[PDB]
Design an enzyme around this catalytic site. Sequence first.
Site: not given
Length: 689
Positions: A73, A259
């Site tokens: 991510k 992230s």
Amino acid sequence: APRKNVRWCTISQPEWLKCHRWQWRMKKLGAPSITCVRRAFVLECIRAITEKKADAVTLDGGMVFEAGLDPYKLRPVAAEIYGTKESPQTHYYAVAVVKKGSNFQLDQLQGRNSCHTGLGRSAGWNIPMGILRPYLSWTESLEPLQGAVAKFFSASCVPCVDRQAYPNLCQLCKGEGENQCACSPREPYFGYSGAFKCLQDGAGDVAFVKETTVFENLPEKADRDQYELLCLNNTRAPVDAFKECHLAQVPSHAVVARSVDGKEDLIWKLLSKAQEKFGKNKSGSFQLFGSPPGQRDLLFKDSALGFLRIPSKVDSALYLGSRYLTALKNLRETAEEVQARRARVVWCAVGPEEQKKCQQWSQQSGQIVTCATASTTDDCIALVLKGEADALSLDGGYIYTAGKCGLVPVLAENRKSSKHSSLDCVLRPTEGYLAVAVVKKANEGLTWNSLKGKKSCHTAVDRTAGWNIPMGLIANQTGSCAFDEFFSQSCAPGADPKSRLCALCAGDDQGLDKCVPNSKEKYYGYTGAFRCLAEDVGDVAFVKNDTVWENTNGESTADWAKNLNREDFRLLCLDGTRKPVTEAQSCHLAVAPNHAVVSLSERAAHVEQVLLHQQALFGENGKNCPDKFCLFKSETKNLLFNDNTECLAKLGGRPTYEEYLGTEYVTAIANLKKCSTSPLLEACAFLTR
Ligand SMILES: [Fe+3]
Ligand SMILES: [Fe+3]
């Protein structure tokens, strides 16, 4: 330091060198000394970054989306800036570039040689394939896209594909050795320019690239005038008419990082200083946005002016935008699956309890209405931006945030009226509800004018009558943004779980999630606020009028409002007097707009369509209400819709949040807002763009 340096990720020796030339120039300037890793796949770069082995890289929209997925991510750290020094833009256009003198259009593309920048990328493969879909004769279950695209074109270099299964694609791909048709500049026809070389070198009849691609490989008109563009219009145009002849507008390449614990700050600082010293036309020694002659788009996108900062709150998904996201998602869904997501409404449930009610709603509706769930309203709103949900009912003060994000009041909840028994709900106008300050009668000392240093129960941070009205009024009397300072203690779920405003919040039976902007926290919302004043935890409760009658005098069976005596309560008027809830026609703090159904514009018509069906099945006069499922009845816990609601009523025209909430109101929210901005409020500001 190991984390005072930003290790940038290259994907080719040439790219690798440009960075080092940058490392030298960035050193003498004393800044996060950039480190430079090397690799060969724009994917492997994503791995390294995610694997804390790298820090950041720049990916085209497509890639961004891909990179943003669960396996790894990443987040759009900084958007690239396009346009001209005087007319900057942060999005581009995908264009169908063809040669002059070719009597072919966009619907005559079957069996021709095409050139794509790279697999997955936006303008070069994504958008084109989204456009062509119909003329694809694709059996989503029998084969992939690379499958039908393969038979669709006679041959097209589409780097990154696996010639193995589909060789007519990499067929046209230049460069020899299995090295041909690669996913890094290693492949000549790969990229933006690479796609032109492909139409330049005679290999194709059309290349899918961005608008300025043509202009970057051909500065002399005489040369350019021999290339045209394919309008969806089914007509051609000159490459200078891309704004009127383009396939679609897509977001600009951004630079992603991890992230969590992803050096967002050191990167950004590093990007601005690089921009300033070697921006477009800053130094001759080293050009940041320009790559040496021969190759192109090394590191950053050539001919890009600067970098716009990304709000550390918009993920890949929010970044890419709603429409593009959808086009992108649908590229993995059959024509059957996508037509299902379209016809069903997806309410967004704020909390575990509300998600439970929607599941039931879903079920009883026959699955016409499905549920997606968020832990807070700002979260359900974000969700609507992702098209991962469709609508949900919002209170005034919340509509604002949703309105400011681009949503729209679809239908408004209408309560029971005093005059008409005639005009039918759906067609009658809203009379709005009243805001009141309640207190127990047995507290004669307390008056509007003596409220300070008291404990307080609010419906929720940012709610109309629960916060916006009260702090609105208390604010213009002190000019102070401080709220941690007007009440000695209070419970306003939503606020910082450490401030005097979360002191009185309790949470669930077990004690968790204290001050959570969802029913989970017990003194939450219209009812949890009054339960709060009732239980003597605080001194005055800020809630709507009817809220008092709804829990006082045997109207509610909540074992805490069972014995409550209505008269046992008092309203705090503004004169400085206290009245009995009966004469609240002259002792309220203000008139507020009914909570209403926000939703996405493209869904407005549809959502309003379905809800008119549901409401009909389980509302006041509904058919399946009493016995199968009552939509607006939550057992005084106001879930999904206000219990005291009689129906979802329509609203003349296509009113905007400002037109619904109220300019006067809206301003008040704005101002109070000035004291603080929401991470979702900042995101949408940039988003709107
Ligand atoms: Fe791109
Ligand atoms: Fe409200």
